[PDB]
Design a protein around this nucleic acid. Sequence first.
RNA 1: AGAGCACUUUUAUCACCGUGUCCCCAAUCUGGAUAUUUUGUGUG
Length: 100
Amino acid sequence: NDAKEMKKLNRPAKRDSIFRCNMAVAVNPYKYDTVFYQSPLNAGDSAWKNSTSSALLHREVTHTAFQYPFALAGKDCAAKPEWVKALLQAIAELNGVAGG
RNA sequence: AGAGCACUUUUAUCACCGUGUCCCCAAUCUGGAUAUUUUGUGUG
């Protein structure tokens, strides 16, 4: 790494951690819901394969909020106040967080 | 600054298709709210 680090002359940033965050939890229990699933075969004549069959399956969903602690820390994040402000604005504009 | 906690749960999909709760039936048969009772008493 960095030609054995003398040319870098900087910290390798190995473990510098900023914006520590926790993991979200729901507010309501789970009551074993189910929604059906069809997935028909792609074609009966296509060159592209058809998985040899078509099978129906199940899913489960629920409606629930998600409380969340933030845990922002560090008095050293003053080098780039613009970056901090942009990050806070992006957090305020959170959307599509889970790649479901 | 805690035996240094990142790099991944990811990308698509109609439970679809047809179907008269139908066909007859009486709440029917009789019964005196009847028997007595003064709005009486006097005024230019």
